[PDB]
Amino acid sequence: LQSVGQIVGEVLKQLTEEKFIVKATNGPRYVVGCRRQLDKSKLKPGTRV
Amino acid sequence: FEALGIAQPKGVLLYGPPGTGKTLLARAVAHHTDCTFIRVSGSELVQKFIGEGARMVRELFVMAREHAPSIIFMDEIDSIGSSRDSEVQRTMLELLNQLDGFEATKNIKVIMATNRIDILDSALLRPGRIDRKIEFPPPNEEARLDILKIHSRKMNLTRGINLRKIAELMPGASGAEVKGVCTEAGMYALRERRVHVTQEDFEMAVAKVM
Amino acid sequence: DVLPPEALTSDQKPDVMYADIGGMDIQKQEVREAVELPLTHFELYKQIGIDPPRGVLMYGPPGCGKTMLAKAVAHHTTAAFIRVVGSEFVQKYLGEGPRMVRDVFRLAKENAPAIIFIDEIDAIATKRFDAQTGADREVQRILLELLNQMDGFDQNVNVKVIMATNRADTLDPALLRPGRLDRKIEFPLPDRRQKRLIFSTIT
Amino acid sequence: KQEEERSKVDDLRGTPMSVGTLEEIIDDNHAIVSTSVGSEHYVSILSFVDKDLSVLLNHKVHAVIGVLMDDTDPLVTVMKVEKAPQETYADIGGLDNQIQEIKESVELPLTHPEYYEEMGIKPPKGVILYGPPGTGKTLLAKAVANQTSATFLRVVGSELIQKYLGDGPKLVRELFRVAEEHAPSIVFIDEIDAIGTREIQRTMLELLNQLDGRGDVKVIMATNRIETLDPALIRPGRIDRKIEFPLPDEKTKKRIFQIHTSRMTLADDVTLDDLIMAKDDLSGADIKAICTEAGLMALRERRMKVTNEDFKKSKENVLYKKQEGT
Amino acid sequence: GIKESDTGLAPPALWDLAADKQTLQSEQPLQVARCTKIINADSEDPKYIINVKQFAKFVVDLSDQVAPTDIEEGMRVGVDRNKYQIHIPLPPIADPTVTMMQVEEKPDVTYSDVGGCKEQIEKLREVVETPLLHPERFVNLGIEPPKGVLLFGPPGTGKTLCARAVANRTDACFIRVIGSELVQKYVGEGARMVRELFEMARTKKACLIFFDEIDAIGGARFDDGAGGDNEVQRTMLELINQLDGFDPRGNIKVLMATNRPDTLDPALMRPGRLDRKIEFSLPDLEGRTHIFKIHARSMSVERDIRFELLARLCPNSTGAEIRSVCTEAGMFAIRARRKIATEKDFLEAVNKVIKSYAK
Amino acid sequence: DREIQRTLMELLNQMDGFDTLHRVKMIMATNRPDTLDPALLRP
Ligand SMILES: Nc1ncnc2c1ncn2[C@@H]1O[C@H](COP(=O)(O)OP(=O)(O)OP(=O)(O)O)[C@@H](O)[C@H]1O
Ligand SMILES: Nc1ncnc2c1ncn2[C@@H]1O[C@H](COP(=O)(O)OP(=O)(O)OP(=O)(O)O)[C@@H](O)[C@H]1O
Ligand SMILES: Nc1ncnc2c1ncn2[C@@H]1O[C@H](COP(=O)(O)OP(=O)(O)O)[C@@H](O)[C@H]1O
Ligand SMILES: Nc1ncnc2c1ncn2[C@@H]1O[C@H](COP(=O)(O)OP(=O)(O)O)[C@@H](O)[C@H]1O
Ligand SMILES: [Mg+2]
Ligand SMILES: [Mg+2]
């Protein structure tokens, strides 16, 4: 119960090793970064996050 | 116009076969009217979300109103130019209303161009709306010869290339395929590792364009 | 902040090569002059000066060996390449059809000299007709957006369009006409010395 | 002045003011309103608002705290010609018997209802006009509708082809439904031809239902091809009047040429008589076309003073544009 | 000076006090959503589904000021801004188009308004009027009172009006329907409109419903059309097969009519749909005389008319044309600007049809 | 109508054209093999 639903969306081009564009589904799109433990190479433009 | 006392024409419809110069005339007009030139793809309109048909016609006929002497070249109006879709039809209803802008649009000249006139409904063709219609016919022998000389002014030429024979050889060419046979004569000068194009190159360009 | 231009292809690079084709020497030579040369020999074109072709269409009996050539040029090309089939251009939500078309083409422009590949264009390029229903309106809008970005007002940067079609007795001539389809080609069924080449290559 | 109220009710209408659309007035102090996002809200009514229903709403509590000018409603308003038309009886040169006919038939009721409701009688239904295209049908319709404040509703007979059963009858029904929703109307079917001589027949029965089933709205019919119509449609005894335009006579044609030439710069070398008085020459629309083409003809020759020869070749070009016979 | 922009507002003596300010600062405004699916685990903590259009759908409950005794499916509910608990069931809507089929009260028609066909309306009343007002002979002799009948006669002449006279003396709410009102560009819902109509009529204190051009509605399936304006095939049986007869019918009276009976589905013809069938013709000589007798009331005329000869000057003809001719004698007065109509007006108004419609 | 044909296209080019590596096979059933579009029946 002490948890929150993470938003589901889809990534676009990287900008840095810590900057990535994501479309947040039918909502808007943002630029965000890796939390700590996500493999950057395992991210590709369009991978679901 | 005052010395004839008549009202100025409201707009122009360029219709006819595809690939005959209406685009080229629009581009050339953009080069010389020296009034503010604005252009709209017919499919840019209506689009997505409500009002994108309302906004893109209304505010368009507000920026045009601001710019006063201006040419709007609508292109391929048929995309929405058909008969009848709701918002789809709403875009034309607003377009009709905006071209029903009374005066101060005497400095607003609309040229919408579209092949295959048939679909275009009578709504915009009525005298309270675009009065003028212009067909662009396929060029004749002299006009084909001249468009040959136009598209071939950049060529590297062998002696005695009788363009008259090729112009005679190519009936019904609507102009775009004249540019096609020019490019194609360039093709069949090229792969023979040549730059001097020959008469039979234009001949077989006529052959393969058909 | 300001984002980079736009917001496409990848390292897929299909296996097939020009060494792998059956031997359609006329067709391979023609299409490669259409696409590959204006990348390299555009330097030679500038001396010849003939406005390199930017649009080629491919007639053929069903799978006559043309999408083979499509994947071959896609893999072998040095320039950027985009592969979006014509039938892929659709939507529920009315109106975005034309924009996504224009997004693909603008993306192509910003991607530097590139070749847009569209297969089965006959699905969304049938000869225009009385659009008495919304679907007809939208598909005709798709066609007209493709037309007007291909020539309608803006001469593009030196991009190219490669297209695949099976029937092509359809395909409204506004698409067919040369200024946007400079060097259309028909792939007929293989015959004397063509079948021999293709047997030899496969065998 | 009302500074006390300015210190109370202006504070009650705490800015900003949202704008929406009312749909229910269920409570005298609570209504139910819609807004831009399409949501619906049961909200309170503050007593200072008009008791009539855009709606001005409190930004926080959505309470109805004002009313405001109407600048909306779907495209049917565009189909309707709500404003009284522009052309008058003075513009129809010489075609004067039709003025009497159309006055007797449909002009009087919409400003004198008693002449068709109170004088021991009940109102009529509809009146048909006929004659060649461009002889004054739509012009006289707009003239008679100009003679009153009622709205003009023109519809061509073949435009209402809806797909499923009775939807064309619906497309006819809505015009009568929204008629007295804002003032009676003058209806005008352009080219009645289509409806009587497969939803068109059900629309015909709908038309006779709207005529008789009488009321204030007057209904015009018109076409050139009247000779084909089924008596089920043109039934005398229910269809009230049958007005006729002959080919424009001499005096009519003088007036029409004069009016159509009123804007361009005439020259005394052309008194329009030669263009006007010989024969069964032409209709008024042909006159207008002649004047327009003569003006253009003078334009291309830069003759910003129209001459006789311009009109002469104008006729020479125009008169060939009709098809042959046997 | 500045110009007002259609802002309203009443004079000071008509508003405010502390009442409005307290009401606005105290009472929460209610947003409006549709209801669905009482969860009803055990019927004391029921819960419900609601739909705020274009925004969301929620599981909610009631505020204890209201009870499930007032909540059903759909029900048009209204809740507060933040916890969305049901605060009010909102009243019905006039959208379902039933309003445009309504007459809603005793029609302005009596059993003598019928033009000579009083025979037919009387045999009608034996099967609708008698088995609601005189039930002392039906079920004791064996069968539950019937409720529905069809009519067919001359072209669009008088047929519907019979229903109006019956609904007048029946003291019944009246609804009249055409096939058009079961049709929209949106499909499938056309069938659902009949379902809505019967339900909204039974929400009335029993009602009388009538259909016209039942040929276009009660006409059977046409497979060989292979498409076209096909909505009929989706909607019509939901009348014919969901329609009830003398036995399976609730507290409702039904009447049918059309000018063309030959195409009607036997399912409509058979019971469970129809309890009687009635035929009409062009008004007979007695009928034509009686129609003019009726219309002598409909205007102010020089009431010395020889209607007996006017009905004979009419050959085989309708009775709607009789009304049209009476209003045409009105036209005769109007074109002459005469304050009253006369027998000559009636004569040449009759000849307006008789000569010009039959020359 | 034509939407069915465009769906056939989507199948018809998804079914080869982008690559072939797939460890994926398609089985199709028909009660009328003749009417099947020749493009599908392609070897
Ligand atoms: N009279 C002409 N002189 C020179 N070039 C011409 C002429 N007419 C057409 N062209 C050439 O035709 C080519 C095709 O474009 P064009 O403007 O003719 O098309 P279009 O009539 O607008 O048709 P579409 O709608 O199919 O684009 C252009 O490159 C233009 O140079
Ligand atoms: N000349 C050839 N040499 C080698 N293989 C060939 C040759 N021609 C055809 N093939 C084989 O047959 C296939 C022919 O199909 P093609 O390349 O035309 O694409 P497709 O997707 O089947 O076409 P379509 O888009 O018309 O449905 C090739 O993919 C290849 O495997
Ligand atoms: N009495 C008239 N006065 C002025 N113009 C007339 C008259 N009759 C016909 N016209 C001309 O003919 C046209 C109107 O005739 P009308 O029969 O209403 O045309 P349509 O058949 O297109 O409705 C107008 O263009 C007008 O110039
Ligand atoms: N003899 C008559 N007596 C009364 N009303 C009549 C008569 N003849 C025709 N009507 C008219 O018929 C109209 C409706 O009945 P009708 O059209 O016959 O129904 P249906 O559409 O089932 O044929 C009414 O408006 C009424 O005025
Ligand atoms: Mg063009
Ligand atoms: Mg292929």
What would the DSSP string read from start to end of E203-238? Answer: HSSSEEEEES-THHHHB---GGG-SSSTHHHHHHHH
Structure tokens at B114: 């579209």
- Residue A29 CB-density burial (10 A; 0-12 exposed, 13-18 middle, 19+ buried): middle
* Distant-in-sequence, close-in-space partners of E29: CB < 8 Å, separation ≥ 6: D41, D42, D43, D44, D61, D62, D63, E80, E81
Contact D172, D161 (CB under 8 A): no
Gap between the Cα atoms of D92 and D135, Å rounded: 10
- Here the tokens at position D192 are 């009645």
- Two tokens at C172? 């409204």
Please identify among residues 1-49 of chain A the ones whose CB lies closer than 8 Å to any CB of chain C: 12-13, 15, 21, 29, 31, 44-45
- Cβ burial of B80 (10 Å; 0-12, 13-18, 19+) is buried
Chain D residue with CA closest to B83: the answer is: D159
CB E157 within 8 A of CB E319: yes
C15/F2 Cβ within 8 A? no
Query: B22 CB contacts (<8 Å, ≥6 apart)?
Result: B14, B15, B16, B113, B115, B136
**Cα D45–D46–D52 angle (5° rounding)?**
65
Q: Show the ligand 3 pocket: residues with CB < 6 angstroms.
A: D 91-93, 95, 133-139, 256, 259, 284-285, 288
Atom index in ligand 3 nearest the CA of residue D252 equals 1
E170 with E74: CB under 8 angstroms?
Answer: no
Which residue is listed with tokens 């080019």? F13
Q: Give the strand pairing for D218-223 and D185-190.
A: parallel
Question: Do D and A make contact, counting contact as 3+ CB pairs within 8 angstroms?
Answer: no
Residue with tokens 């029965």: D205
State the DSSP string of D173-234.
HHHHHTTGGGS-EEEEEE-GGGG---HHHHHHHHHHHHH----S-EEEEEES-GGG--TTTS
Cβ atoms within 10 A of the Cβ of C149, count?
23
Closest CA to E287 of E273, E308, E264: E308
Q: Is B20 in the pocket of ligand 1 (CB under 6 A)?
A: yes
Of E148, E106, E157, E158, residue with least CA distance to E126: E148
Question: Which of E5, E8, E22 is closest to D12 using CA atoms?
Answer: E22
Residue with tokens 């009578």: B122
Residue of C nearest to B121 (CA): C130
Q: Is F38 in the pocket of ligand 2 (CB under 6 A)?
A: no
Task: Report, in this order, helix, strand and coil percent for chain D, each rounded to 5.
Answer: 35, 20, 45
Name the closest-CA residue to atom 22, ligand 1: B23
d(CA C90, CA D18): 38
Of E244, E107, E258, the residue nearest E170 (C-alpha): E107
Task: Give which of C96, C90, C102 is closest to C145, Cα–Cα.
Answer: C102
Pick the closest to residue E97 from E189, E15, E161, E23 (CA basis).
Answer: E189
Which tokens go with D287? 């006159």
Scan for tokens 């800015």, then name that residue: D15
**Apex CA E21: angle with CA E19 and CA E26, to 5°?**
95
Q: How many of the other CB atoms lie within 10 Å of CB of E276?
A: 15
Say how many Å lie between the CA of residue E294 and the centre of ligand 2.
Answer: 86
Contact B70, B108 (CB under 8 A): yes
Break positions in chain A: residue before each gap, C to N over 2.5 angstroms = none
Pair type for strands B108-113 and C80-83: unpaired
| Cβ atoms C55, C180 nearer than 8 A | yes
User: Is the Cβ of D47 closer than 8 Å to some Cβ of chain E?
Assistant: yes
Residues listed for chain C = 203
Tell me if C62 and F18 make a contact (CB, 8 A cut-off): no
Cα–Cα distance, D161 to D153 (Å, whole number): 17
- Tell me the two tokens of residue D173: 């029904």
- Which residues make Cβ contacts (< 8 Å) with residue C114, sequence separation at least 6? C79, C80, C81, C82, C108, C159, C160
Nearest to B114 by CA among B12, B1, B38, B191: B12
Both tokens assigned to E44: 């004391």
Neighbours of C54 (CB within 10 A): 24
Q: Which atom of ligand 1 is nearest to the CA of B25?
A: 17
Distance CA D29, CA E39 (A): 33
CA–CA separation, C146 and B47 (whole Å): 15
Q: Is the CB of B145 under 6 A from ligand 1?
A: no
The nearest CA of chain E is from the CA of D124 a distance in Å of 7
Q: What are the contacts of C190-197 at 24+ separation with CB within 8 A?
A: C190/C22, C190/C65, C194/C22, C194/C23, C194/C24, C197/C22, C197/C23
Per CB distance under 8 Å, which residues of D are interface residues toward B?
A: 75, 78, 263-265, 292, 295, 298-299, 304-306
The tokens describing E133, both together, are: 């007002």
Measured between CA atoms, how close is B192 to chain D, in angstroms? 53
Question: Which string of DSSP letters, residue by residue, matches chain A?
Answer: ----PPP--EEEEESSSS-EEEE-TTS-EEEE---SS--STT--TT-B-
Containing C118, the helix (H) or strand (E) segment is strand C114-119
Short-list E99, E200, E206, E113, CA closest to E163: E113
**Strand order from edge to edge, sheet including E207-211:** E173-177, E207-211, E252-257, E148-152, E277-279
Complete DSSP assignment for E152-215: E-STTSSHHHHHHHHHHHTT-EEEEE-GGGG--SS-SHHHHHHHHHHHHHHHSSSEEEEES-TH
Residue B39's DSSP bridge partners are: B73
Q: Locate C43 and state its tokens.
A: 């330097």
Strand E77-79 to E173-177 pairing: unpaired
Distances, alpha carbon A40 to alpha carbons A16, C6, C9, D90, D278, in Å: 10, 21, 19, 83, 93
The count of other CB atoms within 10 Å of the CB of residue D313 is 12
C134 - beta bridge partners? none
CA dist B132 and B12 (Å) reads 5
Q: How far apart are CA C15 and CA F19, in angstroms?
A: 8
Among D93, D115, D123, D137, smallest CA distance to D262 is for D93
Which positions ≥6 away from E204 have C-beta within 8 Å? E173
**Residue D318 tokens, joined:** 């125009």
C71 CA to middle of ligand 2, Å?
10
Tokens of B62: 């507000």
Kindly provide the resolution of this structure in angstroms, with one decimal: 4.1
Q: Which two tokens stand for residue C144?
A: 């007209």
**Structure letter (DSSP) for residue B6:** P
Distance C9 CA to ligand 2 centre (A): 22
Residue D35: Cβ within 10 Å count? 16
Bridge partners, D219 (sequence order) = D126, D187
Q: What SS3 state is found at E273?
A: coil
Query: For every residue of D154-179, which 3-state class applies, written as one string?
Result: EEECCCCCCCCCCHHHHHHHHHHHCC
Instruction: Give the pairing of strands E30-36 and E48-52.
Output: antiparallel
**What is the rounded distance in angstroms from the CA atom of residue E305 to the CA atom of residue E308?**
8
Give Dmax (Cα) for chain F: 33
Q: Are E243 and E269 in contact (CB under 8 A)?
A: no
Q: Which residue in the block uniquely carries the two structure tokens 């024969």?
A: D279
Tokens of E143: 């069968």
Which residues fall within 8 angstroms of residue C181, CB to CB, at 6 or more apart? Answer: C55, C56, C57, C175
Nearest by CB to A12, which of C1, C7, C10?
A: C7
Give the distance from CA C124 to its chain's centroid.
14
What is d(CA E151, CA E174) in angstroms, rounded to the nearest whole number?
17
